[PDB]
């Protein structure tokens, strides 16, 4: 408790500081693509989307040390930018970054979603057809994930971003500035985010749903209880969320607490009244009664991105209704963090999310004119995971 309250502080020389600047754990991000089996049946006859999952396609991520690390002696905060990098692991993958898949045409779904002005839709329709773009396309893994110049967007006469991709941009970018408490003045505050980009709120959501709560989930304040709700901010889903105690687990001789992401975080205001301010509209959500999805369009420049759990785990039956081929499994598709309760350090985790795009019918865009319903289209799902190294695990029980 005494040696802990000092080696847990985020300042130069402590065990938490070295592991904070650059983690001893190798982090991998595995992708599974939802390969569309009946693109023409969906486009022409408004049938269900038959998908086959293809993966894993594995990348080593979060291997870069934190940058522009600057302590503020006044408020006891420490600032940084976390640089983004992904290195492909052919050794750990089912195929090459060149593998082809039939997937939703991202630019078509997004432009149709964003531009509702009928004169604009008429220009866009002409451009979609001149570039012979359609509701679905064939893309390599490298393109779908990291970016491609869209042939339709390239023709748009008003300013648009012509490069499209699920994680475009990624390399050479950095998430921040994060300002976190170093815990010098009070250990119960170590690593909790003070501000992210100079604010305490995201300006994405209304009321309490906009708050930046907790740490980055790489560690939590020390002396964690089983009764504790752990709050944490995840910039990739653009909101703060929480984890709750599940079971006791032994990781390489280290007694840890397994915290999970509860289905309730994903519930509608019908099951969970606090989630009202995560409901963005009243049509797709069916008057805010659908659940297990998150419309993050406000943080994605208006693009109709919907985040969910893999295979729509913990989701409303109406959300899964238009897709054939999914098989949700609690054990397989949930998110969990294994936390060492004394230090508060995350020694293992699996962050499992699915990326979807909503596509609606259109009166003017011919390529979406035959649609008879809206679709929350699963694009891919991922498992971002890391486990403590054997050496670090034995160094942990000895030095801690």
């Amino acid at each position: 408790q005494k040696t802990i309250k000092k080696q847990v502080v985020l300042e130069e020389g402590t065990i938490a500081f070295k592991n904070w600047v650059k983690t001893g754990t190798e982090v991998y991000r595995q992708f599974w693509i939802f390969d569309v089996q009946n693109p023409q049946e969906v486009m022409m006859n408004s049938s269900n989307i038959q998908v086959k999952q293809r993966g894993p396609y594995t990348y080593r991520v979060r291997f870069l040390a934190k940058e522009n690390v600057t302590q503020d002696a006044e408020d006891n905060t420490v600032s940084f930018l976390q640089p983004n990098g992904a290195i492909f692991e052919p050794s750990l993958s089912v195929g090459t970054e060149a593998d082809n898949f039939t997937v939703l045409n991202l630019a078509v779904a997004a432009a149709s979603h964003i531009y509702q002005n009928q004169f604009v839709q008429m220009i866009l329709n002409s451009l979609i057809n001149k570039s012979k773009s359609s509701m679905f396309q064939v893309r390599t893994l490298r393109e779908l994930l990291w970016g491609y110049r869209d042939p339709f967007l390239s023709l748009v006469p008003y300013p648009v971003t012509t490069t499209v991709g699920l994680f475009y941009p990624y390399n050479n970018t950095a998430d921040g500035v994060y300002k976190v408490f170093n815990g010098k003045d009070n250990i119960s505050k170590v690593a909790i985010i003070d501000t992210y980009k100079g604010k305490r709120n995201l300006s994405y959501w209304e009321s309490h749903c906009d708050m930046i709560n907790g740490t980055d989930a790489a560690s939590f304040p020390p002396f964690v209880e089983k009764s504790q709700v752990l709050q944490f901010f995840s910039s990739d889903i653009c909101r703060s969320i929480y984890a709750v105690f599940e079971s006791d687990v032994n990781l390489k001789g280290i007694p840890v607490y397994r915290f999970v992401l509860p289905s309730k975080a994903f519930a509608s205001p019908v099951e969970n009244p606090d989630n009202y301010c995560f409901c963005t509209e009243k049509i797709i959500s069916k008057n805010c009664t659908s659940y297990g999805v998150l419309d993050i369009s406000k943080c994605k420049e208006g693009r109709p991105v919907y985040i969910s759990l893999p295979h729509f785990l913990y989701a409303s039956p109406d959300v899964s209704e238009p897709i054939d081929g999914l098989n949700p499994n609690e054990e397989e598709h949930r998110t969990y963090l294994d936390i060492e309760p004394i230090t508060g350090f995350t020694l293992q985790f699996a962050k499992r999310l699915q990326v979807n795009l909503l596509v609606k019918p259109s009166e003017k865009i011919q390529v979406l004119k035959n649609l008879k319903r809206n679709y929350i289209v699963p694009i891919l799902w991922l498992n971002e995971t890391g486990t403590i190294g054997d050496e670090k695990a034995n160094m942990f029980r000895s030095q801690v």
């Binding site: 531009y115 509702q116 002005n117 009928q118 004169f119 604009v120 008429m122 220009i123 002409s126 006469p157 008003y158 300013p159």
Partner: protein, 151 residues
């Protein structure tokens, strides 16, 4: 602000009907309104050159009012003006595509394409260029067919 129907519906209907009327001037009174080099005054054509001249001014005025409501749209793409917007929309190839998609008459498109080709199209848009061309044809009409009973 409101037209007989939605602004979008009205806009294309007006554009279509004016293009059709421009063709119907030749289909009905082509003995008067033509591009024939041979400038011989035809009896009773003067009257028709005046009605055609009147129509051009009526459409020029109607068009001004339509452009004015277009410039009042509050959902146009960012960093793009209402005029670049209008101009893109009325460029010959897109104009003919929208008309065909709405009316489904390919031959009507053939006639319009011919009319625009002969107008130097095939005060800023295609419609404006055409209404300017129409003003010159009705002026040429009156210079040839100066009197209802020539001379």
């Amino acid at each position: 602000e409101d037209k007989i129907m939605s602004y979008n519906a009205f806009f294309w209907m007006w554009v279509h009907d004016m293009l059709i009327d421009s063709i119907k001037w030749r289909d009905e009174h082509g003995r008067c309104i033509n591009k024939d080099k041979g400038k011989t005054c035809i009896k009773g054509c003067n009257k028709k050159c005046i009605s055609f001249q009147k129509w051009v001014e009526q459409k020029k005025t109607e068009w001004g009012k339509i452009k004015d409501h277009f410039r009042k749209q509050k959902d146009i793409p960012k960093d793009w003006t209402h005029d670049d917007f209008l101009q893109t929309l009325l460029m010959k190839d897109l104009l003919l595509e929208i008309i065909q998609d709405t009316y489904g008459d390919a031959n009507e498109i053939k006639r319009i394409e011919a009319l625009l080709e002969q107008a130097g199209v095939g005060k800023d848009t295609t419609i404006d260029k055409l209404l300017q061309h129409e003003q010159k044809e009705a002026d040429k009409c009156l210079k040839t067919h100066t009197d209802d009973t020539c001379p």
